[PDB]
């Protein structure tokens, strides 16, 4: 049933979980850290080999339902680290002095909806009072200029902000992990399609972090990284100005905590499918894609 190639519905991906997990008990563990609206389990793979107060580095992807090459890159970056480790010497030494979380689908809810029912689906799947109208923008849902700018506060939108911060169960259960290992994680990733860019903090005002000059330069080493392989053209900076203003965003509210390389990534393509990549893309986009992500590991643990 599962391929790295092709895109995955959440029973397979779910499965994948534990059978990845089985195949490599030395690497990965896995966990649940809370369930969804719907009750779906939320998985978390604990990606390393174990070792004494490691920093680890954590990511997301599937925030939005319809962003398939997000899901897709995470299943791919664990794909490279139990098939790599042992021969490539970088890949081997992070996973011996770091641990990666990766969270592979944040919002199972949207997900299954957007193969049974609707694929340009983006938010959650929870009620609001007082409508009909069915969801929240998980990634304008955390507590970070809450609600202020690039948030809708109809429900019916497609960037709406939910009732309260974190009144997501799954954006909840994220930040109450992220808040439980605060002292280990070094390191905030979350990929999202479409468009190319590697953006950091901040979104939810025209503000520039305390460093500032350190991500500008890490994100752009990055980009330029990225496009060795087959020459895609990303673009880099702050949320604000990169893409556009848009309060409530995991990254942001992780920097707020500390982590002071925050990232997030918007995968292929330009608009040409958009959200509906081809799956003949999955490939080429989560192997270039591999080597920012790389760059940014590196520098992490050189940077200690
Ligand atoms: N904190 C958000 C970083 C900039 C906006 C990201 C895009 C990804 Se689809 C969005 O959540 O609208
Ligand atoms: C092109 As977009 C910010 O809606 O993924
Ligand atoms: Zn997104
Ligand atoms: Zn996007
Ligand atoms: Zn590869």
Redesign the pocket.
Known sequence: GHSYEKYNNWETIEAWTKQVTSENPDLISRTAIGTTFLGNNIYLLKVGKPGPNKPAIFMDCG??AR?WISHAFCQWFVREAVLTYGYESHMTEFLNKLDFYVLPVLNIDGYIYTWTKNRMWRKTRSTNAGTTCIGT?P??NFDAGWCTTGASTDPCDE?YCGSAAESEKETKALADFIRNNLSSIKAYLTI??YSQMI?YPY?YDYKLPENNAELNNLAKAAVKELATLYGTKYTYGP?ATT??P?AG????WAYDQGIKYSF?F?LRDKGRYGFILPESQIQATCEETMLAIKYVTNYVLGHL
């Open positions: 925030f939005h962003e923008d990634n304008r960037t999202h399609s953006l979104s949320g893409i556009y848009a965003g995991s990254d942001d997030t918007e």
